[PDB]
Design a protein around this ligand. Structure first.
Ligand code: ICS
Ligand code: CLF
Ligand code: CLF
Ligand SMILES: [Fe+3]
Ligand SMILES: [Fe+3]
Lengths: 477, 522, 522, 477
């Protein structure tokens, strides 16, 4: 709104920084223009954070262990290093799964080597081999081990690749070494890249020579959906109602066998482009599997995605797609009729990770809500290429925003709702602004698909229109 | 499908028939899952004594630990000083994890910064990182003090904090008079309580070591109180209240209760309350220093006794009747203030509650875990109530602490069946609750999974969890509770007896089967 | 059979095979029990809407009421005065029942006497009973005051308390200067709160009616506080604390929190604390009188407004956020004292808790019952939290109270599904929870049986109970809680959200069935 | 010992009373002499309480509704009068039963007429008839109605007998009017008598002309056991192991059919003589059924009672009795070996209602405990005749003791343990004396039989030896 005001606000916020930090941060804040197609001319992304400025970014270990490898349920994932990292990331992400924990599923469990001073001084490869033996003894029904590195592993001269090779040859088990040390990269995105490379190098090609899996022309894989609150399940059902067959989903509620069967499918359906574009491009190049993006956020995006997917197949699939759309139309129409009057005209600001800042806009507009600012923690420039056409004119765009910047922007813009993570929720709640968690769904969800849209609308209404937001000022003040 | 009048979240929407059929098809078609009988057999095997024998032979594998790393405790200590910014020299993922952990436990904003060291500093060092970070942090958030700790990355590369901060001051990145205390907090040594101790010792040294010439012991007629790692605001509150009721001058060093309990009134306060720099500079002039949790304040005790020349009393944590009495009498002796009648009445009221609930408390068996001082205080209180500690676990405890706990257990007839485990994790504890079933568990939220496992074996094998400790993520506002003093003892007693009574109520709710014992009066 | 190492009480010893066979033989041989299918059919019928229609047609039969009789409240009021003996003119069985009831709720000694009226007095009246009882009570227990109430026995024959006490004083059984206030408390009128009101009005009249000539309003710069029937000691504590923090002079009339919270230190104190006779004599000199529970203090309000000439403010019970704010501003206006920053911060902290827990609180459905003022304060707080009160029951409420509650409900969008029932008992409430299932119930211990009934229908039909109210017999030390002010609102909010979270935890503990939603972080 | 000291203590305590109260109370306190067989020459009982002295006694409504009629599970018991009495007595007594509450069992429920002023002025007989109609409508599986009167019913002139007769003829149901008004009598004892008379007049003789019940020579009834904590059950099993057949059980876990079948048995086994001697004597006079007392408190009394019962039958019953005693000997021997060392030499003071002050001495002596004082709330002089021979020389005997007397006697005697009710528990707990509830078993039990003796010993040890009794004095005091 009123572009010159937004640029003035940007300058006023930047006035406080030292010259180096101000000059750097000036390249990461922008005023959106929907006509612009290339983001390199307006915003700069995927760079190192300025020291001492309260960034929100994580590390490559979080991007690899917590995002990509952790949701794999039948594998045991071992945090190689000191005790803190696996403890802070244990069950913090709501990647839902079905299994018997401790027997054949291990998602919420924390396996670690628990480095001491002696391990730092004299290495930890012998400890790693002994620990792998112990894992094999105590958890027989596991189907593969991954070793996720923390910072000291890369800092000291540890060679986890040789240990993994020897122990895998000895036990006839898949052991995947992931060099996802924290100091690599600038954020979790290099963790995504490293985890995808490990998947390609150690898992994806097991059944290249195997041809015992019967294949159908309607075989698809779900890539980049991590089943937050059941999200992937809420997507999968729709695809099965269309008549497709979902051979695998990466990686929420995912098994290693599904990953190894993925090269046998006819189409890849990529949900999170940011974290899985590497593996999808590799399979297109190697196995010739086409991949396409889809968006199941809100009825409009869901219907458009379903039609786009069905067009990739024959006419029976399109007929089933129309049947599914007709079946689900009354339910989301009822949701819209109930909740749009309570949410029309509200203004939303978002600060999320790599995919969701632009994916959720359509669902918000399906309830009459306008997104006035958005930003990414770690996403690349192609993500901003998509976002710039996704958003409106004179809206605010921020990359790797600092706490001070986000607080000042929110003070000036005064949105009705903010969607961000755990580290901004209470900051903006004490400020008197409704806040929804857009990583964990505030322990609600799923939000994907038609069944998720109802939950999304109910949550928006329950937080935006709660009475507690009208009680922050004492009557005597 | 969703009904707009009654919308279902993940539970119980995924229990619908269509979702169940989808999940069954997925598992049968593409997961290559083990047969359910094989899974049941392996679970039953994991509940046995042979599995426990194999489990306790572990040497290299840790499963579900019960501790964190040092810089988390260093951050918590730094948060307790006035207008102080916690600054972790190292990698930014650590700070993200620390802030998320404390946000989930306290449900409050937690402020901390890092200098964001990357692969470049892995060979050059983080000197430029520290210069730029100190300048940026001071310019942007305007702290009166920056308390510097370390991550394992900078510890492994061997970064010299003292030299780097001195070079930052010398070259003009920050003023020479600006306080920047620092502490090395290697995460491969000790745990979070060790980091708290290290950070406190660093701050105290920074403010007192070079200016001890004009210090006279007892000049300000105050007693220094060092709480240690504490995640209950009620504990700070009760210590302050008890000291104020005695009319005893005191100085609580590292007090974060104000900054972790800010009001929601339309503004964000990054800083609130805390120990002032004047208090820390005047601390050597106190009569004495009392350490509330002495089993992770060894470095602090060494510094206070050696430098400040304070004869630190040998006191246990003021938890439960006897130790609260001993703490009050020691404070009275140090300050010369008589114990007031209000505290005597409060002690009598706690004793009255104990007399009222002893019948339901007697003979109950508890597994428990946590931090060393917290754990031994719990064991002492449980012994005082006639309860039976059986499995006592402390992942970050040592051999001297275990010897002290064994001495406590031997003094009581209710400690006959108790075993103390040091260096054991919660998978060991799961084996223990399966093989020697207690009545209840006491611990943090990570125990909930253990309960789930016990419920899988059978309803008669379930071990309910009572949430006392850190962190508690699945309940709201339990961090406002108290575990110290008579008031904390009353809260713990109420929670224990009412947990017992809800378990009994649940076990006797079956109509015409067990509800003959569903008594109105208990 | 018993194993000496693990002895079994009634539960679960009577679940052994021999006891089960004995019970089956007894039932099959000598009880002539109905077939189990007939019992199941009748239970299912009692859970239906036709049964509810028949149940609400009741005119003469009361099943499981939610109220007591007047002399119980009169005894509770009398206990709040210094060295005062409650004395019930009538039958001794009433006093035995009153003392047992209060002993089970408070877990403390409760002192009360009777004159033990029998059939001889049923013919000739209880004048000699009163003379001998007053003399014996004064000689034996040495009270400074004897507060006389009545049982229905003495009410029916029409015993004249005034004349009988006057004849006792005239003939020398007790001194003329000894205070003996009295009140008629017919148990077939009203309920226990009515008895509290009657006893307080009698005591106030006795001490103030004849000496009003030298009384000037506002002379002592105090505010009178009348609490009414209250069974939470924390409520007295919080009112006194809040008034002291404002620096407001006050006089709490009928304060029993000291005599219901005596310490266990080796001696028995029959009397402890309480309102003095000087305070009651000086009450007309206050600036004003504030009634905390105005819906059962109508007689007291009439006396205070007519005789003391105090312009009693129109205030609701200080429960929740808005009503606590209104109470504080009214007190500030009356006394001229500004509201301190500590109370502002406490209000902000409560608002912060509300903001933290609104997601788990929103849309929840509650059935609730209790006393009128407590019920309406609870409804107001639940509306403030975004919760849905659905079945609001108050056995001792009237039509004006119902109109006020309906006005409260209509002002809020969350009150659209609420129905208020006056004169209905807990069998009606059982029908309501069966036919329109809420998420939870709020009430006293008598609700536990309702939960049992719901569990008999099926696990998906269980309505868990949250114990707030009087009496609570199956939990320990809940009477120490607070329901007034910001602190009481915080306690109630914590209890509600944690009850919701324990229910969710229990519902998602099934391994590989529902434990996909067994989240560590909630 | 020290009889002179005990008498001096009695005089010192009595010194405070006024002349009339002192003269009356002097007849209710005594120093026991085991050689004395006539209590009327020693102590006086069953008299009215002195006004204003804080007695412990209840009323006749408590003795009838709460003790005798309430445990009958298949009957609905209606408190006729104002709301208080049925509310204070609802589920306060732990008479255990098996049944579906609200359908075919009604023990813990409170049925009342809830009198108002209009009912007082214009009577409540029409209300009673309407209420009986509503009871029949809403609780079809009930097997009989009893109407328990409160004080106003007897004071206003209501004719409940006519209503009961008319409605019983109309509905073909047994309706029992009980005139248990509170002001009659001096305690619960007249309630026992009135309830027994109602049983005799309205229930006991229903099957006098019915001879379809097959009878055996081993038919016994349990009379006066109210199944507190399951006590009656813990007795019944032993009798069934002896080979007897328990036809009825009065009245804990009791049904109206058992009461009606009682006149068909061969022997009556009376536990509480005080509350059931009336009905047992009536059945001896009318049906010729002999009755005998028994005591199942502690192994010694249990064994003696079992042998005394078996002597009333043939040799097969005696052989079974010997088998039962041999079977149960090791268990109570183990209990004694475990708990007597912790309880030897302790001194006990008791004050219970009408049977238990003398019945529990043997169990205490089985653990090496000496009872130094005992007393009754409401028991008669034959109870003291039975009591005096069971207690030691120069021990204290008190009838209808006052709170002041009880406190002073405990202060002078300093017992290690006190067993009394709810209204003395906390009084003696704040004094620092261990206290056990001897009415409700402190929500524990059963205490009858061999299975109950283990619970009794564990409870005595857990309360007497609890650490909290050593913590009442602050270390700085
Ligand atoms: S993987 Fe990525 S930060 Fe694509 S690291 Fe992050 S479960 Fe975010 S915006 Mo948390 S690139 Fe997924 C994400 Fe998006 S953990 Fe989740 S919500 S769609
Ligand atoms: S950036 Fe990432 S989270 Fe940080 S360490 Fe590095 S991989 Fe890990 Fe675990 S132990 Fe603690 S938190 Fe660190 S300082 Fe040593
Ligand atoms: S001696 Fe006994 S208990 Fe007393 S009344 Fe009489 S039968 Fe009953 Fe119920 S209602 Fe209250 S308590 Fe009485 S005063 Fe009117
Ligand atoms: Fe908060
Ligand atoms: Fe008590």
């Amino acid at each position: 709104m009123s572009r010159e005001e937004v640029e003035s606000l940007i300058q006023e916020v930047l006035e406080v920084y030292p010259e180096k930090a101000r000059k750097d941060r000036n390249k990461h804040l922008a005023v959106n223009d929907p006509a612009v197609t290339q983001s390199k001319k307006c915003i700069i992304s995927n760079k190192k954070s300025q020291p001492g400025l309260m960034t929100i970014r994580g590390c490559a270990y979080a991007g690899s262990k917590g995002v990509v490898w952790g949701p794999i349920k039948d594998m045991i994932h071992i945090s190689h290093g000191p005790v803190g990292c696996g403890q802070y990331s244990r069950a913090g992400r709501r990647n839902y799964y079905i299994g018997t924990t401790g027997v054949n599923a291990f998602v919420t469990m924390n396996f670690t080597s628990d480095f001491q001073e002696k391990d730092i001084v004299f290495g930890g490869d012998k400890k790693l081999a002994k620990l792998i033996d112990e894992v094999e003894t105590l958890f027989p029904l596991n189907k593969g081990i991954s070793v996720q590195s923390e910072c000291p592993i890369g800092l000291i001269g540890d060679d986890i690749e040789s240990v993994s090779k020897v122990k895998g040859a000895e036990l006839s088990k898949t052991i995947v070494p992931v060099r996802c040390e924290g100091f690599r990269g600038v954020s979790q995105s290099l963790g995504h890249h490293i985890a995808n490379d490990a998947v390609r190098d150690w898992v994806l090609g097991k059944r290249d020579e195997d041809t015992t899996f019967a294949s159908t022309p309607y075989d698809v894989a779900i890539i980049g959906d991590y089943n937050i609150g059941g999200d992937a399940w809420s997507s999968r059902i729709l695809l099965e109602e269309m008549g497709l067959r979902c051979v695998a989903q990466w990686s929420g509620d995912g098994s290693i066998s599904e990953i190894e069967l993925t090269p046998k499918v006819k189409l890849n359906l990529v949900h999170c482009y940011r974290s899985m574009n590497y593996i999808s491009r590799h399979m297109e190049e190697k196995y010739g599997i086409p991949w396409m993006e889809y968006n199941f956020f809100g009825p409009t995006k869901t219907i458009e995605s379903l039609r786009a997917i069905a067009a990739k197949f024959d006419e029976s699939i399109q007929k089933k797609c129309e049947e599914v759309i007709a079946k689900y139309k009354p339910e989301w129409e009822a949701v819209v009729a109930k909740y749009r009057p309570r949410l029309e005209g509200k203004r939303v600001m978002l600060y999320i990770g790599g995919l969701r800042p632009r994916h959720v806009i359509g669902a918000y507009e399906d309830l009459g809500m306008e997104v006035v600012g958005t930003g990414y923690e770690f996403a690349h420039n192609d993500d901003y290429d998509r976002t710039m056409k996704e958003m409106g004119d004179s809206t605010l765009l921020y990359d790797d925003v600092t706490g001070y910047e986000f607080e000042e922007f929110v003070k000036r813009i005064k949105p009705d709702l903010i969607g961000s993570g755990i580290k901004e929720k209470f900051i903006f709640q004490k400020m008197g602004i409704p806040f929804r968690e857009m990583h964990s769904w505030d322990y609600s969800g799923p939000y994907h698909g038609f069944d998720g849209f109802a939950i999304f609308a109910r949550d928006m209404d329950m937080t935006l229109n709660n009475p507690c937001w009208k009680k922050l000022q004492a009557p005597w003040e | 499908s969703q009904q707009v009048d009654k919308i279902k979240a993940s539970y119980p929407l995924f229990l619908d028939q269509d979702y169940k059929d989808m999940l069954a098809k997925k598992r049968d078609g593409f997961e290559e899952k083990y047969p359910q009988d094989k899974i049941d057999e392996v679970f039953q095997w994991t509940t046995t004594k042979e599995y426990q024998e194999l489990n306790f032979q572990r040497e290299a594998l840790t499963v579900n630990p019960a501790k964190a790393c040092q810089p988390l405790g260093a951050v918590l200590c730094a948060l307790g000083f006035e207008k102080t910014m916690p600054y972790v020299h190292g990698s930014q993922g650590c700070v993200a994890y620390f802030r998320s952990y404390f946000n989930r436990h306290f449900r409050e904003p937690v402020s901390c910064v890092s200098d964001s060291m990357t692969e470049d500093a892995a060979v050059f060092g983080g000197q430029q990182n520290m210069k730029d970070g100190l300048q940026n942090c001071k310019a942007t958030y305007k702290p009166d003090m920056i308390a510097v700790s370390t991550t394992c990355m900078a510890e492994v590369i061997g970064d010299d904090l003292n030299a780097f901060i001195n070079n930052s001051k010398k070259e003009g990145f920050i003023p020479d008079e600006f306080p920047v205390p620092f502490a090395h907090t290697p995460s491969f040594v000790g745990s979070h309580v060790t980091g708290w101790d290290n950070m406190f010792e660093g701050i105290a040294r920074y403010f007192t070591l070079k200016s001890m010439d004009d210090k006279v012991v007892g000049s300000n007629k105050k007693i220094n109180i060092v709480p240690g790692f504490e995640t209950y605001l009620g504990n700070f509150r009760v210590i302050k209240r008890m000291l104020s009721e005695m009319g005893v001058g005191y100085s609580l060093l590292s007090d974060p209760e104000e900054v972790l309990d800010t009001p929601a009134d339309g503004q964000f306060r990054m800083y609130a309350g805390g120990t002032t720099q004047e208090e820390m500079k005047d601390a050597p002039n106190a009569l004495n220093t009392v350490l509330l949790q002495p089993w992770h304040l060894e470095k602090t005790k060494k510094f206070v006794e050696g430098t400040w020349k304070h004869e630190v009393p040998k006191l246990n944590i003021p938890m439960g009747l006897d130790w609260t009495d001993e703490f009050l009498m020691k404070v009275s002796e140090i300050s010369g203030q008589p114990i007031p009648a209000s505290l005597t009445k409060e002690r009598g009221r706690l004793v009255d509650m104990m007399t009222d609930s002893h019948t339901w408390l007697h003979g109950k068996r508890f597994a428990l875990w946590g931090d060393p001082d917290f754990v031994m205080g719990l064991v002492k209180f449980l012994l005082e109530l006639g309860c039976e500690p059986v499995h006592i676990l402390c992942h970050n405890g040592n051999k001297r602490w275990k010897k002290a706990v064994d001495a406590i257990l031997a003094a009581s007839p209710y400690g006959k069946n108790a075993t103390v485990y040091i260096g054991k994790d919660l998978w060991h504890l799961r084996s223990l609750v399966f093989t020697d079933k207690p009545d209840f568990m006491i611990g943090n939220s990570y125990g909930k999974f253990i309960q789930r496992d016990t419920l899988h074996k059978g309803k008669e094998f379930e071990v309910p969890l009572i949430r006392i400790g850190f962190p508690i993520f699945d309940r709201h506002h339990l961090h406002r509770s108290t575990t110290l003093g008579y008031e904390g003892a009353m809260q713990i007693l109420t929670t224990l007896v009412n947990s017992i009574l809800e378990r009994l109520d649940e076990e006797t709710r079956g109509m015409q089967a067990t509800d003959y014992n569903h008594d109105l009066v208990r």
